[PDB]
Structure formats: structure tokens, C-alpha cells
Curated annotation (Swiss-Prot):
Present with 1710 molecules/cell in log phase SD medium. Disulfide bonds: none annotated. One of its GO terms (biological process) is nuclear-transcribed mRNA catabolic process, 3'-5' exonucleolytic nonsense-mediated decay. It is found in: Cytoplasm; Nucleus; Chromosome. WD repeats lie at residues 19-40, 65-98, 120-147, 181-203, 219-245, 266-289, 329-356. SMART domains: WD40 (SM00320). Its main location: cytoplasm. Gene3D superfamilies: YVTN repeat-like/Quinoprotein amine dehydrogenase. This is Antiviral protein SKI8. It comes from Saccharomyces cerevisiae (strain ATCC 204508 / S288c) (Baker's yeast). The keyword Cytoplasm applies.
Length: 356
């Protein structure tokens, strides 16, 4: 397979772009500058992404994670939610709607929850939608989202959302350590990565530990099937991918040629679960055939890739070259989301890039 550049935005944020997510309607990025940025997916015949972009300030501590949920509520109510976590440990919620794109901050968490310092997060789309998050102390949280507070509000489509804590699962290790990453599968499995190289899988709806196994985990992603778990982890300055069968937790394989000459920062399975994209701090997006565990293609990121020459960022804050900017995050987009499976990544040169 061959992936090609379709659109990009240089100097997209005023600070580092740590995380990116997408739904049918739009890609959303978040940055250490404190802003969310929404990017229309229905972009035109090579039109400037920035002209179809909408920013919203969230928290001056900066944002390090963002995920978007988009569904229709019984052919009636368009539901589009963004969750993002800040460096202060806050976990903020915004409803998104369309003169054009509007952000509405939601008050969902109680006082008890707000004492935690949230890190990683992930929506579990459709009986109600779920959300999962970690905090820095190593605990994972599981909520159920409701667009309507009671049935009277539901019967009138009266927006009044709540978040109901289903419970938590705790960190296996001696003293508890930083939980860097999370995911939730379609089959109902939760996986949590930690900064000591450990990973604990728990059962959703039980919320009880099933098992675990043992340098820091950076990303954790269930394949769409749910039968395989890909894990990015540091290992003596290099970045490694280890695959695990998901039932007993046996390691079944790995991806190499180590996976990246520097850290593997993020993972993203395509829709079929056949391809796996690795985002690397070496500034590479490598794609892996999952079944044969074999590298298929590589995209090398360069600061001079930016279509508008004016917002090429060739040098960082200290004078060091951004010739090959590391990739903070990557996400596969479904077939018909962009204007044929798409992809999006965000890199150290403060750029966001769409492909294929």
C-alpha cells in the first residue's frame, strides 16, 4: 500500500500538539497552548485547513489528551462530545454543534472526581456510551454517559448530560505508578499502560482485573476485533511494539525492522485491524501488516512538507533542527470521513497532517 499527503497545517497551534482524534465531521487536536482546535473533515478540493478551523481555549496549563465521540441519538439528536485532559489534571467536556462550530463546556464531574489528576482518556462509543480515564496515581475510571438527566428530558430531546461513575480498577504494582495510557475494546475489555512497563487488562462491566504483564508504556490499543492488543513501550532509548493475544495475556509476537530507532509515541489500528500505524519520535509513521508482523511502508515526516511555505517551522525553541519532527500522535480515520481510509498525525514542528 501507498499513503500520500492530502492536506496539512503548519504552526497549527502556538505550542506542542500532543494529541489528535477524529469523527466523521471533524478532526480535533489539542495543544500545550491550552486550546482545542476543530478541523472540518469535509474539506474541499485542496483548500487551506486553517480556513475551516475553529479554536476554543480550555485551560492555561495546556492540554495533552483529546478524544471525540460522535453518534446520532435515535435519528434525532446529533451528539458530538469532546473530552480533553490538561496538565493541571483537569478533565474537561465540551458539546460541539453548528453560525458555525460552537463549543459548550459541560459540568459533569463531582467534587470527589475533581481531586484526581487525570491523564489518559478514551471514549467507548455505543447500552449508553462509556468513557475511560486514568490519573497519575495509576487508577483507571469507568463512567457511563447520558445525554439526558431523566426521561422527561429525553422525551423532549432536552440536553442535560450526566456522567455516572461505574467504578474503578487499581494498579497491580507495589507502590502504584503513573498510568500513561488507556484503551477500551468493542468486546468490552479495558487496558491500562503504566510508566514502569506494566500493563493491566480488566473486564468492563466487572471492573475486575483479569491479568497483567511486564520501561514505560506509551500507547495501548485493542485491534478492532478485540482479539489482539498492541503495546508501544520504551526499551534502552529505542521504541518497541509487542503484540499480545487477549484472553490469557500471552505475548504472541512483536514488530521490528526494535520497531523505531526512537520512542514509539502512539499506535493506531486501521478499521479492518489488518494494518497498524506506529508514530515515532524518530519522525516516522511506519505501517505494519498485523498477521505477518511485517513492515509494509514508511512515511518520513519533514518540516518542509508544509504546503504553505510561510508556516514551515524549520527550527525549535533552542535553535535545533526540526528537519525530521517527532510524531506525538496518529489516528486512522474511517473510509468516508475525509473528502480510501484516511490518517492524521501531529508532530513536534507544531503541525497537523492528513494522509491518503
Amino acid at each position: 500500500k501507498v499513503f500520500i499527503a492530502t492536506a496539512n497545517a503548519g504552526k497549527a497551534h502556538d505550542a506542542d500538539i500532543f494529541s489528535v482524534s477524529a469523527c466523521n465531521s471533524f478532526t480535533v487536536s489539542c495543544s500545550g497552548d491550552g486550546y482545542l482546535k476543530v478541523w472540518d473533515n469535509k474539506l474541499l478540493d485542496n483548500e487551506n485547513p486553517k480556513d475551516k478551523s475553529y479554536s476554543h481555549f480550555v485551560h492555561k496549563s495546556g492540554l495533552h489528551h483529546v478524544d471525540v465521540l460522535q453518534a446520532i441519538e435515535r435519528d434525532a439528536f446529533e451528539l458530538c462530545l469532546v473530552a480533553t485532559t490538561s496538565f493541571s489534571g483537569d478533565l474537561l467536556f465540551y458539546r460541539i454543534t453548528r453560525k458555525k462550530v460552537i463549543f459548550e463546556k459541560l459540568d459533569l464531574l463531582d467534587s470527589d472526581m475533581k481531586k484526581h489528576s487525570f491523564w489518559a482518556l478514551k471514549w467507548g462509543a455505543s447500552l449508553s456510551h462509556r468513557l475511560v480515564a486514568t490519573d497519575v496515581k495509576g487508577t483507571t475510571y469507568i463512567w457511563k454517559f447520558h445525554p439526558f438527566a431523566d426521561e422527561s428530558n429525553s422525551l423532549t430531546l432536552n440536553w442535560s448530560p450526566t456522567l455516572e461513575l461505574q467504578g474503578t480498577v487499581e494498579s497491580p504494582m507495589t507502590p502504584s505508578q503513573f498510568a500513561t495510557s488507556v484503551d477500551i475494546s468493542e468486546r468490552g475489555l479495558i487496558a491500562t499502560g503504566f510508566n514502569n512497563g506494566t500493563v493491566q487488562i480488566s473486564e468492563l462491566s466487572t471492573l475486575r482485573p483479569l491479568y497483567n504483564f511486564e520501561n514505560s508504556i506509551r500507547s495501548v490499543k485493542f485491534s478492532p476485533q478485540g482479539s489482539l492488543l498492541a503495546i508501544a513501550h520504551d526499551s534502552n532509548s529505542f521504541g518497541c511494539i509487542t503484540l499480545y493475544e487477549t484472553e490469557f495475556g500471552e505475548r504472541i509476537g512483536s514488530l521490528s525492522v526494535f520497531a523505531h530507532s526512537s520512542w514509539v509515541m502512539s499506535l493506531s489500528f486501521n478499521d479492518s485491524g489488518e494494518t497498524l500505524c506506529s508514530a515515532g519520535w524518530d519522525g516516522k509513521l511506519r505501517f505494519w501488516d498485523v498477521k505477518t508482523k511485517e513492515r509494509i511502508t514508511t512515511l518520513n515526516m519533514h518540516c518542509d512538507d508544509i504546503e504553505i511555505e510561510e508556516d514551515i517551522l524549520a527550527v525549535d525553541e533552542h535553535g535545533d533542527s526540526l528537519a525530521e519532527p517527532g510524531v506525538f500522535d496518529v489516528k486512522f480515520l474511517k473510509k468516508g470521513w475525509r473528502s480510501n481510509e484516511s490518517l492524521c498525525c501531529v508532530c513536534l514542528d507544531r503541525s497537523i497532517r492528513w494522509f491518503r
